[PDB]
Amino acid sequence: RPRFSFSIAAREGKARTGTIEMKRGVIRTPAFMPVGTAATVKALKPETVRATGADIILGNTYHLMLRPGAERIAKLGGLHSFMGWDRPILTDSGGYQVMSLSSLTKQSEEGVTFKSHLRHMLSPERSIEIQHLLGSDIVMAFDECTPYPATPSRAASSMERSMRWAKRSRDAFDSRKEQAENAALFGIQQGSVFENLRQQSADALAEIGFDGYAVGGLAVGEGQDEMFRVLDFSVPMLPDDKPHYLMGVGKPDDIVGAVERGIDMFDCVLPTRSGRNGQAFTWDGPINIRNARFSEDLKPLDSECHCAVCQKWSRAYIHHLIRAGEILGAMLMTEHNIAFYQQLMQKIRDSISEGRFSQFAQDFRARYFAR
Amino acid sequence: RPRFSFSIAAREGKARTGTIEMKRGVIRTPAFMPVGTAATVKALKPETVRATGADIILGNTYHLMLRPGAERIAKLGGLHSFMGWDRPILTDSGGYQVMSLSSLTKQSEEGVTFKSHLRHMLSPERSIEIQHLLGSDIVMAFDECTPYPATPSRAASSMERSMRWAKRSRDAFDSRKEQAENAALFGIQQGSVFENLRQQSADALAEIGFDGYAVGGLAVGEGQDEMFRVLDFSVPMLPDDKPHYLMGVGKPDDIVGAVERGIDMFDCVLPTRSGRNGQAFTWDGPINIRNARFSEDLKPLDSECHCAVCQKWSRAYIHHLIRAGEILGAMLMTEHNIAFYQQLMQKIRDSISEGRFSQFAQDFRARYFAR
Ligand SMILES: CN(C)c1ccc(C(=O)O)cn1
Numbered sequence: 006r007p008r009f010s011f012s013i014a015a016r017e018g019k020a021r022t023g024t025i026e027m028k029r030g031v032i033r034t035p036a037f038m039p040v041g042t043a044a045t046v047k048a049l050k051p052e053t054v055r056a057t058g059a060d061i062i063l064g065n066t067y068h069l070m071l072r073p074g075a076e077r078i079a080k081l082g083g084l085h086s087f088m089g090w091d092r093p094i095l096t097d098s099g100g101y102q103v104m105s106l107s108s109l110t111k112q113s114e115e116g117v118t119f120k121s122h123l124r125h126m127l128s129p130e131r132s133i134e135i136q137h138l139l140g141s142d143i144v145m146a147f148d149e150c151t152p153y154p155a156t157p158s159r160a161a162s163s164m165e166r167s168m169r170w171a172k173r174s175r176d177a178f179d180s181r182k183e184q185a186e187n188a189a190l191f192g193i194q195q196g197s198v199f200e201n202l203r204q205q206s207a208d209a210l211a212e213i214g215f216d217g218y219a220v221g222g223l224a225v226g227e228g229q230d231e232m233f234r235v236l237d238f239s240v241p242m243l244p245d246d247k248p249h250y251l252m253g254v255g256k257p258d259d260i261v262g263a264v265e266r267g268i269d270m271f272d273c274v275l276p277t278r279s280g281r282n283g284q285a286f287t288w289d290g291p292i293n294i295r296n297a298r299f300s301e302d303l304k305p306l307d308s309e310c311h312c313a314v315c316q317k318w319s320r321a322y323i324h325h326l327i328r329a330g331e332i333l334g335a336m337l338m339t340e341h342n343i344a345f346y347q348q349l350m351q352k353i354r355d356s357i358s359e360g361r362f363s364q365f366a367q368d369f370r371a372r373y374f375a376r
Numbered sequence: 377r378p379r380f381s382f383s384i385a386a387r388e389g390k391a392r393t394g395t396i397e398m399k400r401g402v403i404r405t406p407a408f409m410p411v412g413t414a415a416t417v418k419a420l421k422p423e424t425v426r427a428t429g430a431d432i433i434l435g436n437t438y439h440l441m442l443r444p445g446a447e448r449i450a451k452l453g454g455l456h457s458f459m460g461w462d463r464p465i466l467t468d469s470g471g472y473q474v475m476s477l478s479s480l481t482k483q484s485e486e487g488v489t490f491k492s493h494l495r496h497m498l499s500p501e502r503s504i505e506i507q508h509l510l511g512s513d514i515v516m517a518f519d520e521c522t523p524y525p526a527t528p529s530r531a532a533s534s535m536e537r538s539m540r541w542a543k544r545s546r547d548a549f550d551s552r553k554e555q556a557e558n559a560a561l562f563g564i565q566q567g568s569v570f571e572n573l574r575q576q577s578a579d580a581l582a583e584i585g586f587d588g589y590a591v592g593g594l595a596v597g598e599g600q601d602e603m604f605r606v607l608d609f610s611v612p613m614l615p616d617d618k619p620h621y622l623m624g625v626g627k628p629d630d631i632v633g634a635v636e637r638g639i640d641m642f643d644c645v646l647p648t649r650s651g652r653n654g655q656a657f658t659w660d661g662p663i664n665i666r667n668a669r670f671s672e673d674l675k676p677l678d679s680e681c682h683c684a685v686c687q688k689w690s691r692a693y694i695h696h697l698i699r700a701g702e703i704l705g706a707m708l709m710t711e712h713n714i715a716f717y718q719q720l721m722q723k724i725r726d727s728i729s730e731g732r733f734s735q736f737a738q739d740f741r742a743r744y745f746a747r
Pocket residue numbers: 070075076124125126127131134135138
């Protein structure tokens with residue numbers, strides 16, 4: 006099977022639908038990746054993750070390098086064997102997480118030294134090596150997510166450092182023949198909200214050359230309007246013939262609008278985390294299942310959802326489970342939310358393929374926001 | 377299908393194996409009932425409970441009458457529909473739980489008034505009605521579990537009250553034609569450690585007449601030796617031709633020894649609760665999966681277990697999950713422990729049927745305690 010082959014089957018405006026073929030399976034795009042932070046998609050067996058329609062999951066390099074450790078996972082046969090997921094895994098680089106999760110950090114041109122919340126170092130070379138030891142299929146270049154807001158000058162110097170780190174990541178990945186032959190490497194565009202910096206970043210990444218390109222530095226507090234504004238000019242700067250990835254996004258309407266702007270891949274903790282906290286996504290908007298109005302509601306979470314939860318259990322039961330703090334409540338909410346996200350992605354893919362994505366997006370928004 | 381028909385297929389010493397046929401399914405005996413306290417067997421979908429081999433589960437009347445409430449469950453179609461378990465359910469009476477869980481209680485001949493940890497009343501008639509509203513298949517008569525230790529005189533007066541409550545439970549159950557036609561009613565023997573009181577209690581229960589008989593008042597701190605001593609003389613006092621139930625028991629060796637003394641049915645929170653806390657049952661004794669010795673152990677929890685967990689995941693992975701506080705850890709530990717308990721019951725049933733239970737019990741104990 007191919008290491009990495011991206012094919013665009015159909016387009017509508019800036020939106021694309023297609024497939025990424027990899028050795029461990031095919032990824033249908035636009036794709037949503039459930040987040041499997043600590044070698045588990047929380048509250049789901051891998052077979053259940055797959056049953057929802059997911060083609061690929063995300064692993065958190067920052068968490069896994071601390072617990073259980075990357076050398077340990079490698080000794081146990083790699084992340085796929087360890088967690089029982091045999092399909093593609095994308096691993097984050099650690100460059101965002103180290104700054105988001107660490108109790109203390111020191112940043113330099115070499116990388117980032119940090120203290121765990123549970124002293125360590127990340128760098129382009131170490132991040133690539135950790136991702137190699139994990140055995141991930143899509144490796145992310147180690148970057149620096151510029152804080153928001155940032156002065157143009159600080160955004161520029163941060164972006165330039167990230168581009169030097171992208172080149173170092175490329176070189177480290179290419180040096181490990183088994184990794185280069187079996188995995189893919191994505192680069193991360195930075196530049197904050199500044200068009201000229203985003204252009205320089207895209208040019209630098211294209212000159213290095215990557216299998217896919219993320220629009221980094223978003224979903225960091227700027228809000229949907231500004232995120233969409235940045236996507237409007239940033240995505241067209243990336244190579245058209247490779248996948249475009251938006252990290253940490255998002256709500257269903259964030260995804261639809263990002264696809265309209267040329268994004269092919271997404272990951273977000275929202276469906277899993279908010280499911281555990283009682284928020285279920287429905288075609289009529291999110292609901293908080295703990296609310297008293299659901300205590301005697303015998304309808305499923307969503308009456309058009311195809312997931313196993315909605316075939317078998319009522320709102321009233323899941324309301325009881327979540328209020329009681331029962332693990333099964335988290336399980337059922339999470340399975341439904343991930344299945345909902347996958348059904349959304351399927352509707353996106355089908356509508357683009359069929360040349361009716363614009364109408365789908367309008368109809369989706371009208372109903373989702375009508376609640 | 378029959379409301380309730382118990383058939384003994386084979387005996388060895390005091391041990392019996394057979395079947396209870398009920399409208400919602402067959403129960404193979406000796407039987408272990410997973411505990412589904414708050415309308416869920418913690419961390420397991422009902423299909424997974426069934427896949428482990430369970431024929432019947434237990435529901436906690438005290439919890440369910442408070443949350444979500446018995447009238448509410450009845451309005452939603454009964455406990456079976458509510459939780460998605462279509463096979464038999466046994467409900468406890470509340471008589472033990474009210475005294476174990478309540479913040480304050482007042483006891484009288486009428487029943488028990490109590491304050492919830494989350495003011496209420498239980499009585500023979502109310503307990504029967506609540507169990508009716510839940511729709512359970514095996515209804516437990518409302519009793520009083522005599523504290524241990526107890527003077528002979530206090531054990532006698534407590535037992536006599538329990539027998540009056542057993543008669544009131546019988547009458548209330550028989551008054552509700554739909555309940556009497558579709559469910560079974562079990563009586564609970566009391567009498568503490570005193571042979572003469574246990575005999576009076578058995579005689580009273582047999583004179584009232586029940587579908588099954590529990591040996592109550594045990595597993596309340598007396599220890600295994602004394603429990604076995606009481607079972608030695610108590611079980612033969614019960615009608616031989618009806619099932620014998622031991623509530624809240626127990627560890628694998630407790631079960632084996634109780635079967636050797638004529639017990640046919642068991643429930644216990646140990647496999648579920650201890651699974652969530654990191655204790656896995658194996659044929660070589662219990663293990664605490666969080667222990668450092670399992671961090672790189674690629675064997676399954678038990679290398680002879682037939683459960684799905686042991687086909688797919690290692691000790692090392694489950695060790696990581698539990699240490700990380702991950703829900704999947706609780707799920708996998710609980711599924712394995714319940715499956716282990718069911719495999720134990722299957723080995724018990726097969727060995728009795730085959731006339732080799734004595735040898736099985738000896739071989740089981742030799743290995744389980746060798747660790
Ligand atoms: C290169 N690898 C395996 C690394 C690098 C750094 C660390 C750490 O600081 O804890 C761990 N693994």
